[PDB]
Amino acid sequence: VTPIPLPKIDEPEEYNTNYILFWNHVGLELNRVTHTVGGPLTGPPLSARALGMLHLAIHDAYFSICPPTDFTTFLSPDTENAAYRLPSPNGANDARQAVAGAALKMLSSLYMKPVEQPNPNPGANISDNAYAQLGLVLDRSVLEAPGGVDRESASFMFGEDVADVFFALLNDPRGASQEGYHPTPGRYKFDDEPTHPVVLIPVDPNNPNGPKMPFRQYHAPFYGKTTKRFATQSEHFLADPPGLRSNADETAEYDDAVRVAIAMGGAQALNSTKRSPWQTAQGLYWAYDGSNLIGTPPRFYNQIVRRIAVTYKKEEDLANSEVNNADFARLFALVDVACTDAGIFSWKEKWEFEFWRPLSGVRDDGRPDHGDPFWLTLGAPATNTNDIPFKPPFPAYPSGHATFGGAVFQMVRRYYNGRVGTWKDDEPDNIAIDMMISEELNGVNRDLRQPYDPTAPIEDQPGIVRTRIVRHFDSAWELMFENAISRIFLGVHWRFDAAAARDILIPTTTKDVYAVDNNGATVFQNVEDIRYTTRGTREDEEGLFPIGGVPLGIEIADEIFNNGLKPTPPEIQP
Numbered sequence: 001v002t003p004i005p006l007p008k009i010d011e012p013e014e015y016n017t018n019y020i021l022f023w024n025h026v027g028l029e030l031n032r033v034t035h036t037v038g039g040p041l042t043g044p045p046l047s048a049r050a051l052g053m054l055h056l057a058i059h060d061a062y063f064s065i066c067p068p069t070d071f072t073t074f075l076s077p078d079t080e081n082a083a084y085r086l087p088s089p090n091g092a093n094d095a096r097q098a099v100a101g102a103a104l105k106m107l108s109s110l111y112m113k114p115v116e117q118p119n120p121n122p123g124a125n126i127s128d129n130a131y132a133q134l135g136l137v138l139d140r141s142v143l144e145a146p147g148g149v150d151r152e153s154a155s156f157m158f159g160e161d162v163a164d165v166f167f168a169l170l171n172d173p174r175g176a177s178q179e180g181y182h183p184t185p186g187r188y189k190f191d192d193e194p195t196h197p198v199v200l201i202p203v204d205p206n207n208p209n210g211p212k213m214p215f216r217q218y219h220a221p222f223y224g225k226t227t228k229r230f231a232t233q234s235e236h237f238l239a240d241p242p243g244l245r246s247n248a249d250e251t252a253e254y255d256d257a258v259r260v261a262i263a264m265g266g267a268q269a270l271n272s273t274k275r276s277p278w279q280t281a282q283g284l285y286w287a288y289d290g291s292n293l294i295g296t297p298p299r300f301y302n303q304i305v306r307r308i309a310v311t312y313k314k315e316e317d318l319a320n321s322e323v324n325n326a327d328f329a330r331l332f333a334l335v336d337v338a339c340t341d342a343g344i345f346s347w348k349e350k351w352e353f354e355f356w357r358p359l360s361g362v363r364d365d366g367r368p369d370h371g372d373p374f375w376l377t378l379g380a381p382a383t384n385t386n387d388i389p390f391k392p393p394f395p396a397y398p399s400g401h402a403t404f405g406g407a408v409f410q411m412v413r414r415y416y417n418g419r420v421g422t423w424k425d426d427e428p429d430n431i432a433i434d435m436m437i438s439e440e441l442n443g444v445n446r447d448l449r450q451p452y453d454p455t456a457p458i459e460d461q462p463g464i465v466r467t468r469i470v471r472h473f474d475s476a477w478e479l480m481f482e483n484a485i486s487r488i489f490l491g492v493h494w495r496f497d498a499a500a501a502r503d504i505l506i507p508t509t510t511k512d513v514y515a516v517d518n519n520g521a522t523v524f525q526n527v528e529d530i531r532y533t534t535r536g537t538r539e540d541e542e543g544l545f546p547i548g549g550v551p552l553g554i555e556i557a558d559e560i561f562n563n564g565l566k567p568t569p570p571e572i573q574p
């Protein structure tokens with residue numbers, strides 16, 4: 001088959017001389033390729049799960065052969081429970097080959113054709129071409145691997161055994177099933193997107209030019225409540241969103257949120273849009289909304305973490321440094337596991353409340369002096385395509401981006417504290433990064449004038465090129481914040497989906513009503529002054545709970561870290 005020409009990644013090629021980074025890279029490539037061809041593990045929660053599984057297998061394969069001192073492996077060889085029993089090296093001492101076997105085995109199990117019956121129902125929607133393209137990626141990776149891959153070595157075989165264990169234990173085949181789910185219309189209730197109420201999908205994925213059929217997607221409605229958690233030691237909950245349950249009386253907050261939604265996230269040319277050009281840039285920068293050649297948010301978070309890892313490595317040699325190898329293997333396991341669990345809990349809460357998106361909220365408001373029946377958002381960018389595709393929708397509260405970001409960046413902060421600088425674990429850090437480029441704004445990717453052509457490189461396809469923006473960030477606290485508010489700029493999330501409005505916005509004399517500038521744009525607090533302290537109530541439980549995705553993510557990362565990356569006790573699994 002013709003290999004899809006993938007655009008160049010903005011990153012020092014030296015990074016991939018390190019075999020831990022190389023395998024992470026392979027995972028990211030499969031991430032973007034599967035979203036281009038419509039293969040398995042698409043969507044934010046499951047794409048995160050794939051990376052978590054990959055790095056867990058790598059972590060244990062490496063630390064089995066090169067034992068750590070301040071922590072231990074995720075699974076152990078002495079576990080009585082066969083499902084959690086880690087294989088023993090038994091002579092194998094080649095860490096490079098162990099990692100290769102674990103990574104290759106895991107990625108292959110994840111992305112290859114489900115010959116073992118699983119093709120029915122679960123995989124019955126992916127074309128043969130999708131699988132073929134994914135295979136190409138896997139095949140050339142073997143050839144590009146630093147130091148090569150010796151599939152016959154005992155160490156390689158050991159890595160494979162490790163992968164088998166993790167795959168059998170954590171794989172969730174029916175994770176994205178929506179069978180049986182249907183929206184329950186009403187105020188504050190999630191339903192089909194007014195701009196994309198239905199999709200025409202081919203009856204046969206192998207014949208895309210053939211007959212289509214109407215389809216209504218709902219992204220992983222049962223995943224969060226039924227899936228196996230990775231390293232969390234408890235269930236996490238958020239306060240009821242403004243307008244629902246115990247907080248149904250928070251009308252001032254809700255009304256002002258509608259107001260901020262229109263002004264900050266509307267389409268570019270609307271007279272009601274007050275968002276600045278720079279804010280529009282911040283919105284698109286963090287998107288990665290499953291587009292062609294781009295993938296999902298977990299991919300971007302890993303791209304950023306790769307830069308942090310190299311920027312703050314202990315030793316200069318990326319190729320032959322066990323200090324670096326152990327550092328990266330540990331960091332990525334921590335980060336990708338936190339990201340996986342963040343996906344689980346954000347999805348659990350999303351479908352629990354089933355809160356509607358701003359587009360529907362503003363349009364269906366019903367009050368002549370509050371709503372706008374014809375409003376349009378800036379929206380999730382449909383990069384490298386010529387239209388606005390129907391992307392499987394899901395509820396608004398809390399923001400997936402916000403939760404992912406909170407988890408990933410708080411994990412990075414906990415890991416580097418005392419090493420890059422010193423700070424209170426709940427206060428701004430100093431982990432700065434430079435020359436960070438998002439593929440949404442890289443001067444290469446674009447909004448096509450005609451349908452995407454997978455046999456030609458993106459540069460030879462007509463369209464409006466996305467401006468190349470090179471960013472610098474002063475801290476992981478800033479990254480966390482901007483990643484969260486970017487969704488407000490796109491108009492896909494309410495302010496409270498990110499965090500409590502009180503913690504991120506500038507207050508006025510009027511309660512629940514926040515400050516706007518001379519031209520009506522919403523004013524945010526300075527990043528250095530932001531503290532996620534405001535909590536709220538839940539109708540079904542006593543106590544105070546976090547509001548929005550960022551606080552939820554921070555909470556998940558702290559828990560995992562404090563427990564040193566230990567499996568969720570099987571007793572508390574769904």
Ligand code: VO4
Pocket residue numbers: 044396398399400401402487492493
């Ligand atoms: O991925 V949101 O849940 O931030 O659209």
